[model samples]
Target: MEHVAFGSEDIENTLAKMDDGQLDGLAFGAIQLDGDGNILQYNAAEGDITGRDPKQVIGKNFFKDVAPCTDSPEFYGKFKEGVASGNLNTMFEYTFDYQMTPTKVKVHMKKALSGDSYWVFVKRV
Candidate 1:
């Protein structure tokens, strides 16, 4: 499936309802992170895509420790802004050099309705 649209209420509802196990089964990458970008739920699909063991990722800062490319002003900046404003949901295309080779993926970030967690949904392009 192609990357899902971010602004639709239907898509938002669907994403909000998915649990970690449900997201893990998706063919693409689905990561759940905290406000500080720490990985809280790294699904099996995400682990396979990143080639990093889940054990090594959970509780780790995604932007700092795992994907340093995102630590920049563009990626992480948006996330910080989103959280600060109490609303953060967006999607874009990005490249990941942390892999064996630079890989391109579609990225989607959504703030949980609970207002405590952030979910990043990635799909290989």
Candidate 2:
């Protein structure tokens, strides 16, 4: 489990730079969520990685609807904690079994300084 070095200075800047586009330029999956875990943005890369359609995921609750596999304490709990505390910048490796197979991935959770939005960066391991 390690922190993958992303190209941008941090999640906030990375998200800002990708704001004007489809966010497909990134090599990894990028799922932007509101403070309450509602899906605000789901990039193509993320849809491809999870084998789901972006249209079906956007505007939904990510943990409960789109990816219930992460509803456990280790994953969803951390997200809730981050939202409540207003400090959520962490990364580690984990395996996700949401659909077809168990995929090993590096997970990065970053909360924006504004405290209104957050991002989940996933890279296949």
Candidate 3:
């Protein structure tokens, strides 16, 4: 597997190379989405941390079905901008409280050169 850290500079390319198994090995939550917000890969760590079943979430809309809380401009806007420009690389702190207890995490969004897949990494505080 390629060496790719969560916070590594220019990590998008490295992350793009990862297969489903490699992404599952990550300690943090890795949510791979398509340009239209369709979920592609919802990794194991994310599934465990969020108590969500990736099997059910794989094809759902991240901003609609799974996380309508992020449908707002503040959260979804950043993601849209990235998809628009084909170069999305940003990180910030966000709280997940759509259901259950509040889950505060470090949110990192990056897009590979292909611009086909965008990865949203969630690291617990």
Candidate 4:
């Protein structure tokens, strides 16, 4: 198995304090994108969320390979638009299947590190 970079203590601390009942399958990443959309610094929870080991995800295309759910222009366009407009706080509700169960989730996204990166908190309702 290839070695994957580990996430920092700060991200782990925040995930630990999250409300257990409302948030499951949580993950965080430094949200790196190369000019070609290659990923870096994919965190441990981020790997677990997609059921893939971290080594497999690092350097992969995040939108295409990992969260294909977020690949649509309807979803990705808004994210890029938010970054451009400096209104990076975003929230929306959507449903996805988790082991054949329709899981409803509310996603809250924020631009971190002065808009150079993003932090997302997803809660199940």
Candidate 5:
């Protein structure tokens, strides 16, 4: 299996080819969201990192339910823009805040090379 880093330039291509099992094996968090903002796939690492169950996240609204912390224009705004522009490839540092000790992470978002599903990659800083 190919190793993909959080800063991989060909993330769209690599993520597009990876299976759920492969994604689950990654050290960082990986999430696949549809154009409608629904969580289509959530990996095990994300479950461990964020303490969010993939089973509960999948099929749910990512912004409204899962991570409302990113509902802001900076995160979700960029995501919403990507949905319409088809240019969702971008990266930035973000802090996740809920009830736990605010986890700091680097986030990379991109649209799959062959599909409309958007990928969100997270690595703790």
Candidate 6:
């Protein structure tokens, strides 16, 4: 399937139903990265969360275009294991500099069928 990323206005419309305090204070970016770390699906609730525009990110390699800081032995090693074992429902909190904005986000990820790809959802508080 094609990658999908939301526009700024589209993002606002989505969060409109949310609590105002939660709306402004929270944001997130989601992307499906392949085993090789290529991006497949991308969406935005907070533009600055990933420091990238839809055009700049959708077709690029996620680990390189967006979060190059994860290129470590330990991190990469475990990531491969997580994917290989078909482990589903991976959730965690981490710190990352998204779009030059320093923020903490909770991330959720899971395995996909052989044809299905990974899905990523992140929310900020």
Best by lDDT: 5
Q: Give the clashing residue pairs of candidate 6, or none.
A: 51-99
Output the worst ten-in-a-row residue range by lDDT, candidate 6. Answer: 1-10
Residue 45, candidate 5: alpha-carbon lDDT = 85
What is candidate 1's lDDT per residue for 1-125, written digit by digit as tens? 33445345555566667766666666667777888899988877777767888767889999889998788777899999988888887888888887557878888888876567887877788
Expressed as tens digits, the lDDT of each residue in 94-118 for candidate 3 is: 8888775788889898886564888
> In candidate 1, how many Å is residue 116 off?
1.3
Each model's lDDT: 0.77, 0.78, 0.84, 0.50, 0.86, 0.55
Clashing pairs in 5: none
Poorly placed runs, candidate 1 (over 4 Å): 1-12, 15-19
Q: Per-residue lDDT for 90-110 in model 6, tens only?
A: 566666663566677776665
The clash count of every prediction, one per candidate, is 0, 0, 0, 0, 0, 1
Expressed as tens digits, the lDDT of each residue in 1-125 for candidate 4 is 22221233244334334333223233332344433345544445433444456566667876666666676665566677766775556667765443335656665555544325555544455
Every model's Cα RMSD, please?
2.9, 4.0, 1.7, 8.7, 1.4, 9.1
lDDT per residue as tens, model 2, 1-125: 12324635565764665552447666778888998889988777777778988777789999888888789888899999998988888787878786768888888888864559888888888
Which regions of candidate 2 are displaced past 4 Å?
A: 1-9, 20-22, 113-115
Candidate 5 lDDT over 1-125, as tens digits, reads 34777777877777776778888978789899999889988999888778888988889998998898899999999999999998888889999987557999999998977677888989888
Candidate 2 lDDT score at position 118: 88
Best model number under TM-score = 5
Alpha carbon deviation, residue 1, candidate 5 (Å): 7.8
Per-candidate TM-score against the hidden true structure? 0.83, 0.86, 0.90, 0.54, 0.92, 0.63
lDDT of 1: 0.77
Q: How big is the positional error of residue 107 in model 6, measured in Å on the Cα after superposition?
A: 0.9
